């Protein structure tokens, strides 16, 4: 029971939608970040057990990762792009909170966040 349940990636009670913005988030934004050399620690929930970070889920109570975001986008979990943008920002913020300055995971998150902001800068207008 050492790791928490992951964030939900489906919910039969949550209304679902496709928008051009959510298609762009999957096809352009997530695709760009996912194949980056720094993506791999962010491609699934933090395994606090295997990594021996027992305080991770004592400190981080709103976990998020690109594995979860990928499944949410694939499952049409989101109603709008802003929900998905908030998930990316949660993932980056958690990294900046939990880790100390000089930690390479912070420099990796900063590089992914810079690329994230470049890609969402041209988020297309809603059709
Ligand atoms: C999201 C997340 C993941 C993560 C992972 C990981 C690796 C595979 C999956 O997850 C490892 N270590 C972390 N923190 C380290 C804590 C100890 N300091 C000294 C170095 C810290 C550090 O910078 N570690 C990195 C991990 C990636 C390779 C370079 C070293 C992580 N912190 C995070 O917020």
From Swiss-Prot:
Crosslink position(s): Glycyl lysine isopeptide (Lys-Gly) (interchain with G-Cter in SUMO2): 58
Tell me the ranges covered by the Bromo domain, including all copies. 17-123
Q: Any idea where this protein resides?
A: Nucleus; Chromosome
Q: How is it modified after translation?
A: Phosphorylation by CK2 disrupt the intramolecular binding between the bromo domain 2 and the NPS region and promotes binding between the NPS and the BID regions, leading to activate the protein and promote binding to acetylated histones. In absence of phosphorylation, BRD4 does not localize to p53/TP53 target gene promoters, phosphorylation promoting recruitment to p53/TP53 target promoters.
- Hey, where's the site called Acetylated histone binding on this chain? 99
What is this protein's tissue specificity according to the annotation? Ubiquitously expressed.
Q: What is the effect of changing residue 104 to G?
A: Found in a patient with a neurodevelopmental syndrome; uncertain significance
Medical condition linked: Cornelia de Lange syndrome 6: A form of Cornelia de Lange syndrome, a clinically heterogeneous developmental disorder associated with malformations affecting multiple systems. It is characterized by facial dysmorphisms, abnormal hands and feet, growth delay, cognitive retardation, hirsutism, gastroesophageal dysfunction and cardiac, ophthalmologic and genitourinary anomalies. CDLS6 inheritance is autosomal dominant. A chromosomal aberration involving BRD4 is found in a rare, aggressive, and lethal carcinoma arising in midline organs of young people. Translocation t(15;19)(q14;p13) with NUTM1 which produces a BRD4-NUTM1 fusion protein.
According to the record's subunit comment, the protein's assembly and interactions are: Interacts with p53/TP53; the interaction is direct. Interacts (via CTD region) with CDK9 and CCNT1, acting as an associated component of P-TEFb complex. Interacts with RELA (when acetylated at 'Lys-310'). Interacts (via NET domain) with NSD3, CHD4, BICRA and ATAD5. The interaction with BICRA bridges BRD4 to the GBAF complex. Interacts (via NET domain) with JMJD6 (via JmjC and N-terminal domains); the interaction is stronger in presence of ssRNA and recruits JMJD6 on distal enhancers. Interacts with NSD3. Interacts with NIPBL.
Summarizing the function annotation, the protein's role is:
Chromatin reader protein that recognizes and binds acetylated histones and plays a key role in transmission of epigenetic memory across cell divisions and transcription regulation. Remains associated with acetylated chromatin throughout the entire cell cycle and provides epigenetic memory for postmitotic G1 gene transcription by preserving acetylated chromatin status and maintaining high-order chromatin structure. During interphase, plays a key role in regulating the transcription of signal-inducible genes by associating with the P-TEFb complex and recruiting it to promoters.
State the remark under miscellaneous.
JQ1, a thieno-triazolo-1,4-diazepine derivative, and I-BET, a benzodiazepine derivative, have been tested on tumors with success. Treatment with GSK1210151A (I-BET151, a I-BET derivative) has strong effets on mixed lineage leukemia and promotes myeloid differentiation and leukemia stem-cell depletion.
Q: Which family does it belong to?
A: Belongs to the BET family.
Regarding domains, what does the record say?
The NET domain mediates interaction with a number of chromatin proteins involved in transcription regulation (NSD3, JMJD6, CHD4, GLTSCR1 and ATAD5).
What is this protein's name?
Answer: Bromodomain-containing protein 4
Originating organism:
Homo sapiens
Counting on the full-length protein, the chain here runs from 44 to 168 of 1362
């Amino acid at each position: 029971s050492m790791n928490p349940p992951p964030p939900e990636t489906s919910n039969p009670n949550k209304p679902k939608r496709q928008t051009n913005q959510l298609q762009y988030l999957l096809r352009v934004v997530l695709k760009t970040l996912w194949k980056h050399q720094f993506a791999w620690p962010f491609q699934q929930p933090v395994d606090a057990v295997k990594l021996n970070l027992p305080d991770y889920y004592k400190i981080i109570k709103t976990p998020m990762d690109m594995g979860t975001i990928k499944k949410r986008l694939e499952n049409n979990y989101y109603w709008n792009a802003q929900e998905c943008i908030q998930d990316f920002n949660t993932m980056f913020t958690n990294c900046y909170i939990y880790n100390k300055p000089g930690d390479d995971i912070v420099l990796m998150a900063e590089a992914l966040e810079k690329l994230f902001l470049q890609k969402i800068n041209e988020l297309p207008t809603e059709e």
